[PDB]
Enzyme design. Structure first.
Site, PDB file in Angstrom:
ATOM      1  N   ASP A   9       0.548-126.561  39.095  1.00  0.00           N
ATOM      2  CA  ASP A   9      -0.309-125.349  38.296  1.00  0.00           C
ATOM      3  C   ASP A   9       0.363-123.653  38.563  1.00  0.00           C
ATOM      4  O   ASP A   9       1.265-123.624  39.845  1.00  0.00           O
ATOM      5  CB  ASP A   9      -1.266-125.101  39.483  1.00  0.00           C
ATOM      6  CG  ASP A   9      -2.812-123.961  38.738  1.00  0.00           C
ATOM      7  OD1 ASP A   9      -2.061-122.935  38.882  1.00  0.00           O
ATOM      8  OD2 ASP A   9      -3.310-124.050  38.445  1.00  0.00           O
ATOM      9  N   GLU A 469      -0.636-127.558  34.023  1.00  0.00           N
ATOM     10  CA  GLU A 469      -1.826-127.275  34.323  1.00  0.00           C
ATOM     11  C   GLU A 469      -0.809-125.307  34.367  1.00  0.00           C
ATOM     12  O   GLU A 469      -0.315-124.932  35.172  1.00  0.00           O
ATOM     13  CB  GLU A 469      -2.963-127.326  34.876  1.00  0.00           C
ATOM     14  CG  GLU A 469      -4.129-125.481  35.242  1.00  0.00           C
ATOM     15  CD  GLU A 469      -4.475-125.387  34.293  1.00  0.00           C
ATOM     16  OE1 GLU A 469      -4.527-125.987  33.409  1.00  0.00           O
ATOM     17  OE2 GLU A 469      -5.681-124.633  34.544  1.00  0.00           O
ATOM     18  N   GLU A 473      -3.540-116.808  32.019  1.00  0.00           N
ATOM     19  CA  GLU A 473      -3.094-115.059  32.464  1.00  0.00           C
ATOM     20  C   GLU A 473      -0.964-115.135  31.691  1.00  0.00           C
ATOM     21  O   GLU A 473      -0.084-114.042  31.256  1.00  0.00           O
ATOM     22  CB  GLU A 473      -2.624-114.798  33.356  1.00  0.00           C
ATOM     23  CG  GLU A 473      -2.055-115.057  34.840  1.00  0.00           C
ATOM     24  CD  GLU A 473      -3.430-114.899  35.831  1.00  0.00           C
ATOM     25  OE1 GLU A 473      -3.765-114.566  35.693  1.00  0.00           O
ATOM     26  OE2 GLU A 473      -2.604-115.769  36.695  1.00  0.00           O
ATOM     27  N   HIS A 553     -26.441-132.124  26.163  1.00  0.00           N
ATOM     28  CA  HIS A 553     -24.784-131.580  25.369  1.00  0.00           C
ATOM     29  C   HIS A 553     -26.183-132.156  24.056  1.00  0.00           C
ATOM     30  O   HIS A 553     -26.201-133.485  24.074  1.00  0.00           O
ATOM     31  CB  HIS A 553     -23.890-132.444  25.621  1.00  0.00           C
ATOM     32  CG  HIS A 553     -23.543-131.828  27.351  1.00  0.00           C
ATOM     33  ND1 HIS A 553     -23.807-131.273  28.028  1.00  0.00           N
ATOM     34  CD2 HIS A 553     -21.647-132.160  27.207  1.00  0.00           C
ATOM     35  CE1 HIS A 553     -23.314-130.845  28.746  1.00  0.00           C
ATOM     36  NE2 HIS A 553     -22.105-131.265  28.548  1.00  0.00           N
ATOM     37  N   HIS A 683      -4.409-122.022  45.179  1.00  0.00           N
ATOM     38  CA  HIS A 683      -2.774-122.379  43.739  1.00  0.00           C
ATOM     39  C   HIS A 683      -3.037-124.342  44.231  1.00  0.00           C
ATOM     40  O   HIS A 683      -3.213-124.727  43.041  1.00  0.00           O
ATOM     41  CB  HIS A 683      -2.094-122.760  43.674  1.00  0.00           C
ATOM     42  CG  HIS A 683      -1.708-120.724  43.692  1.00  0.00           C
ATOM     43  ND1 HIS A 683      -2.021-119.808  44.186  1.00  0.00           N
ATOM     44  CD2 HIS A 683      -2.585-120.256  42.434  1.00  0.00           C
ATOM     45  CE1 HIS A 683      -1.812-118.203  43.259  1.00  0.00           C
ATOM     46  NE2 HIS A 683      -2.233-118.461  42.853  1.00  0.00           N
TER      47      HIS A 683
END
Lengths: 1027, 87
Positions: A9, A469, A473, A553, A683
């Site tokens: 990440d 991933e 930002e 959905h 994180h």
RNA sequence: UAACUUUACGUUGUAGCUCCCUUUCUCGAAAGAGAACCGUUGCUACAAUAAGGCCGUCUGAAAAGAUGUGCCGCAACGCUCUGCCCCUUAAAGCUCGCUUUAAGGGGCAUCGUUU
């Protein structure tokens, strides 16, 4: 030895990593290790400037002042050696003694009276020193001055300065950051030539040709602007033909090479696809640059004639290729008047190539007429030697060009063309190339990610797969990030307003209306009091009813993986019981165009749905494969570059061929919500969520949703393993789930027994690689930096704690008004200043917007008070401006720790002490100033040296502290330490201020790895020198 | 070994500039700086003709001065390199 | 992206002119005035404008101090060269577990490249 998938990440200020063990079918079975690494983003947090801006500005200022000083020195040498100077007037390492203090009045009075030899050097030096200009205010000022000169009697700029320039505003030179009193250098040439002519007219033995030549050379001496590197500007050799020199970036063949290379890979983007130019398109765009200069983004478009369906790989308006040499030669021929404005250049390519080589190899008139006399016509050489100058050298020889160009014209690609004419895998990732990554933040983040990857590969081995991933930002400019934050804040405020609206309809709904019912009610509002599929109407009894309305959905999950915000709709109680995994195109008889479809289209055509959702009502045979592939991957530059780089440049012991899976963001949130998982340690949570999203889990999720889509459950979502939400939380936070008041386990034994007690049913919860998480921070051990603050202070009264600084009135406040140097020597001025200050409640901008005047005794006024010098405390500082100024100390760069008598002493080391090489000898003592500090001698043992962001540990009589040293207060002697994870519940914002290093039982600095492991003490041997 | 404004570019080559990487830093930095400055000055010693403010004799006066400065700079650099003992 | 010629500022010191001004000197019409050593408002001129390192040349024995129509000096990245720290294996010995030398792997730089 161990098969595992590594999940990353990546953010702009941190990188979380996790490792998940897998079986032969890519299914998580264990959680081996996880961690977080933290650094500082490669930008200025306050504004957003790059890390290398102040250095560039300082370097430019240094070069500017050095050049100006050297120019003045050369002017002095020329005026002494090439004319009448009476060199007895120059003394020591000094200047012309008794130099007049009014050049401005002298320069405007040299046309009506002779100037003394002592009054000529003054005006010449003044002219050389302030030589004017060669971005709106400056241009407007010089334009206004030029207009004023040609209107009234202003034959000399000095006369303009003396007459109308100073009598109005009371000054000649500009003050503050304004731009009115600027002059042009051409006007200074005019004034200089008028000075010399009209002053030799009156007399004076000076004004020889040497004086005029020297002053004109010095006045119009400007260094030529640098561009590019310096190796590229040299005459090397050929990579293919080691017998011929290089070629210039001016010849016909080299620029043909450049044009063909740029044209081959244009890659016209058709709606996002790859649409290269074919033979017939490249047969027309080829000759356009050679015919017109400004071939921009849209200039080719007109030749293409597309209809906005073909972009390029308004705002998008840049020259894709420009004819520099060709149009330069054409203009050089035209300005002499021997060629029409628009005509083909009547010159063979060999001639232009040879003149380019000659112009780039020789820079003197004689040599250029020594090699071009026998090839071009007599007029051509002179026409070229008036407006032509070339530089730079390409890396391809002239001989190889005659072979490379024809093949690239034939359509052969660059690489195969040069191959016909004439990235191995490694264990660790190579350094990230900065050529493609034109961003500092992205480069720093990828460098830290590469460091983490190399470390984990070293510790464990080659990973089977890497699941990357990246937060939304990353790969964005600062302004876009700020817009994202403000949009998020506005969305939160709107959500709160919607919640407040919700609290009115049904107060009896439990005691906390949550956001799920909020979304249900909002989607109800989107339907505008209508129902979907079923076709019934509103005024149902209870909005929840536990079964009346179900969010479903429209496009089935099993085929699309497209939760998003458009797909979800809310229906009524009736219908939806026999829908299945069918898109509306195969359920409402839309294929045969029946009423069951047109009626519902008409019903929903009055809704308030978004454009994307409104046009998602029907999908004419959408690709049932790529769509689910598009929502499961990432389509941004950084992710694609990472995938390619880790795919080619290192070894991944996987099974397939695309062994790098860059995941999306919505899928990660969906997985974390489904599996239970709801400070600077979260994180690793997304890292674990990301490394368990294998294709097998996707298969099981699809099977589960497809089975539950038909209402065929006549069970929760599949999970990687039983007891997932508990083990992950225990491993990350060391506490039970959702208990911020529980104790924290920061030891192997405590974490192990907590795992064995709370997860006794899972024998795999413990292994030989379990360790409580320790956040790691990037060290910063640079000994370079600023030398002192920008401002400098007078050092006359430095015996006491005193220093004088001139501050403007508009910046002075009431706090510094009581510290004015002249507080008792003029009483009335201080009283008036207090009265003006104690009117707007310490508002200097609104109080001193009016002029200040020192009122004379018994009335009247006097001259303004624009700035006042105040007195400030100064116990120590840095001597600068050649022992004429004192400056505040710079940022602390080193601390030395000494031990004696079970007591610890800190010796601070700054940047200027490192520069001068004077290592300090005085340890800080609380209260007393530097002169009373404890001197260091051979009786003080040296333990270690502390740099910012270094792992330290102290053992005081009250508790034990283990953190990262950040700053040391020279006024008290207490160091500050940040907690490893920056926990908001410990200290003030994760820091422990005022730690008492002195009298501590133990104090030592620790060493940490890049993965947060290997925490061992380090005992430094001997004191390292500053330089 | 003499440096002249006519045969100048045959000596100021990338190979010659890169031969300096063996010298110690205290000597390596000054000669490399001199070589770089001379090369840049020679490369930019003719933009005075491209600017229309340096009209008439000033243009080739600046050109001659710049060429002489560049050739003197590389003469100094090659003399220092010769003293350091390279070929 | 990253960089590049300049220009106009700001601050410090000195010099010139200039306004306020707290002591101390110089007096017969009590009011003030004059000269000074200091503070300090404003205008102009000049020097410095990071602290400082390299290299060349001069006086020369303890060292400078100047001098130059030369570069570097608040950043990023990296480990071919140099240093610090940590970790393995080896020659060992400690005193009864720390160092000397190592080979290798890393982290950070006073080291390397770009500027």
């Amino acid at each position: 030895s161990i098969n595992y998938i590594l999940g990353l990440d990546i953010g702009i200020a941190s990188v979380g990593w996790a490792m998940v063990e897998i079986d032969e079918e890519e299914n998580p079975i264990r959680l081996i290790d996880l961690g977080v690494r933290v650094f500082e983003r490669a930008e200025v947090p306050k504004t957003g400037d790059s890390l290398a801006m102040a250095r560039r500005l300082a370097r430019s200022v240094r070069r500017l002042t050095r050049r100006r000083a050297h120019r003045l020195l050369r002017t002095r040498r020329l005026l002494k050696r090439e004319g009448v100077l009476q060199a007895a007037n120059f003394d020591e390492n000094g200047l012309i003694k008794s130099l007049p203090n009014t050049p401005w009045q002298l320069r405007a009075a040299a046309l009506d009276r002779k100037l003394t030899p002592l009054e000529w050097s003054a005006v010449l030096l003044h002219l050389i020193k302030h030589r004017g200009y060669l971005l709106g205010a400056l241009l407007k000022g010089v334009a206004g001055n030029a207009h004023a000169l040609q209107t009234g009697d202003f034959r000399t700029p000095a006369e303009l300065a003396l007459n109308k320039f100073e009598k109005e505003s009371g000054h000649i030179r500009n003050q503050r950051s304004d731009y009115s009193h600027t002059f042009s250098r051409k006007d200074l040439q005019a004034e200089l030539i008028l000075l010399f002519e009209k002053q030799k007219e009156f007399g004076n033995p000076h004004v020889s040709g040497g004086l005029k030549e020297g002053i004109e050379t010095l006045l119009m001496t400007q260094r030529p602007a640098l561009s590019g590197d310096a190796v590229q500007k040299m005459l090397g050799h050929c990579t293919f033909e080691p017998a011929e020199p290089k070629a210039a970036k001016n010849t016909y063949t080299a620029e043909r090479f450049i044009w063909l290379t740029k044209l081959n890979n244009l890659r016209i983007l058709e709606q996002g696809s790859e649409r290269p130019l074919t033979d017939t398109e490249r047969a027309t765009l080829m000759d356009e640059p050679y015919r017109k200069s400004k071939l921009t983004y849209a200039q080719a478009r007109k030749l293409l004639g597309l209809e906005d369906t073909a972009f390029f790989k308004n705002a998008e308006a840049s020259t894709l290729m420009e004819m520099k040499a060709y149009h330069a030669i054409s203009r050089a021929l035209e300005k002499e008047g021997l060629k029409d404005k628009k005509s083909p250049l009547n010159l063979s390519p060999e001639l232009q190539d040879e003149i380019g080589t000659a112009f780039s190899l020789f820079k003197t008139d004689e040599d250029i007429t020594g090699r071009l006399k026998d090839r071009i016509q007599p007029e051509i050489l002179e026409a070229l030697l008036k407006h032509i100058s070339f530089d730079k050298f390409v890396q391809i020889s002239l001989k190889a060009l005659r072979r490379i160009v024809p093949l690239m014209e034939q359509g052969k690609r660059y690489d195969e063309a040069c191959a016909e004419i004439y990235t191995e895998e490694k264990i660790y990732l190579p350094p990230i190339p900065a050529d493609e990554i034109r961003n500092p933040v992205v480069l720093r983040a990828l460098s830290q990610a590469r460091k983490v990857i190399n470390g984990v590969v070293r510790r464990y081995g080659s990973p089977a797969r890497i699941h990357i991933e990246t937060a939304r930002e990353v790969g964005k400019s600062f302004k876009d990030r700020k817009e994202i934050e403000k949009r998020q804040e506005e969305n939160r405020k709107d959500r709160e307003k919607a919640a407040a609206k919700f609290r009115e309809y049904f107060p009896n709904f439990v005691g906390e209306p949550k956001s799920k019912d909020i979304l249900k009610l909002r989607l109800y509002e989107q339907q505008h009091g209508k129902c979907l599929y079923s076709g019934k109407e509103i005024n149902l009894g209870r909005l929840n009813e536990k079964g009346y309305v179900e969010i479903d959905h429209a496009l089935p999950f099993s085929r699309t993986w497209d939760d998003s915000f458009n797909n979800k709709v809310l229906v009524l109680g009736s219908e939806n019981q026999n829908k299945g995994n069918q898109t509306p195109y195969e359920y409402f008889n839309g294929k045969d165009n029946s009423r069951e479809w047109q009626e519902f289209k008409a019903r929903v055509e009055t809704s308030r749905f978004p454009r994307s959702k409104k046009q998602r009502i029907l999908l004419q045979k959408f690709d049932e494969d790529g769509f689910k592939e598009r929502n499961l991957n990432d389509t941004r530059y950084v992710n694609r570059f990472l995938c390619q780089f880790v795919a080619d440049r290192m070894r991944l012991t996987g099974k397939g061929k695309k062994r790098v899976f860059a995941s999306n963001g919505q899928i990660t949130n969906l997985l974390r919500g489904f599996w239970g998982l709801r400070n600077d340690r979260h994180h690793a949570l997304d890292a674990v969520v990301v490394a368990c999203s294998t294709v097998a889990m996707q298969q099981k999720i699809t099977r589960f949703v497809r089975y539950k889509e038909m209402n065929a459950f006549d069970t929760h979502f599949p999970q990687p393993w039983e007891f997932f939400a508990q083990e992950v939380m225990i491993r990350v936070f060391g506490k039970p789930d959702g208990k911020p008041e529980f104790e924290e386990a920061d030891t192997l034994e405590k974490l192990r027994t907590l795992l064995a007690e709370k997860l006794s049913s899972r024998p795999e919860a413990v292994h030989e690689y379990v360790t409580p998480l320790f956040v790691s921070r990037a060290p910063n051990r640079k000994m370079s930096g600023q030398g002192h603050m920008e401002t400098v202070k007078s050092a006359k009264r430095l015996d006491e704690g005193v220093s004088v600084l001139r501050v403007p009135l508009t910046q002075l406040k009431l706090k510094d008004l009581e510290k004015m140097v002249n507080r008792e020597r003029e009483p009335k001025l201080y009283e008036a200043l207090k009265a003006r200050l104690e009117a707007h409640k310490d508002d200097p901008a609104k109080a001193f917007a009016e002029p200040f005047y020192k009122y004379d005794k018994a009335g009247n006024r006097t001259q303004q008070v624009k700035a006042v010098r105040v007195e400030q405390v100064q116990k120590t500082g840095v001597w600068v401006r050649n022992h004429n100024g004192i400056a505040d100390n710079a940022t602390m760069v080193r601390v030395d720790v000494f031990e004696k008598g079970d007591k610890y002493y800190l010796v601070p080391i700054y940047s200027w002490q490192v520069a001068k090489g004077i290592l300090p000898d005085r340890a800080v003592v609380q209260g007393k100033d530097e002169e009373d500090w404890q001197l260091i001698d051979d009786s003080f043992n040296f333990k270690f040296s502390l740099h910012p962001n270094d792992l330290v540990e102290v053992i005081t009589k009250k508790a034990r502290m283990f953190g990262y040293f950040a700053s040391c207060h020279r006024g008290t002697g207490n160091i500050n330490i940040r907690i490893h994870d920056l926990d908001h519940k410990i200290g003030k914002n994760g820091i422990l201020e005022g730690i008492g290093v002195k009298t501590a039982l133990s104090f030592q600095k620790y060493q940490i790895d890049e993965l947060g492991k290997e925490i061992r003490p380090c005992r430094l041997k001997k004191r390292p020198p500053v330089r | 070994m003499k440096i002249t404004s006519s045969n100048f570019a045959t000596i100021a080559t990338s190979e010659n500039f890169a031969k300096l990487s063996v010298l110690p830093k205290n000597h390596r930095e000054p000669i490399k700086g001199l070589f770089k400055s001379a090369v840049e000055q020679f490369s930019s010693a003719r933009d005075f003709f491209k600017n229309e403010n340096y009209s008439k004799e000033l243009a080739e006066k600046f050109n001659k001065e710049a060429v002489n400065e560049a050739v003197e700079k590389l003469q100094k650099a090659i003399d220092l390199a010769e003293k350091q003992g390279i070929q």
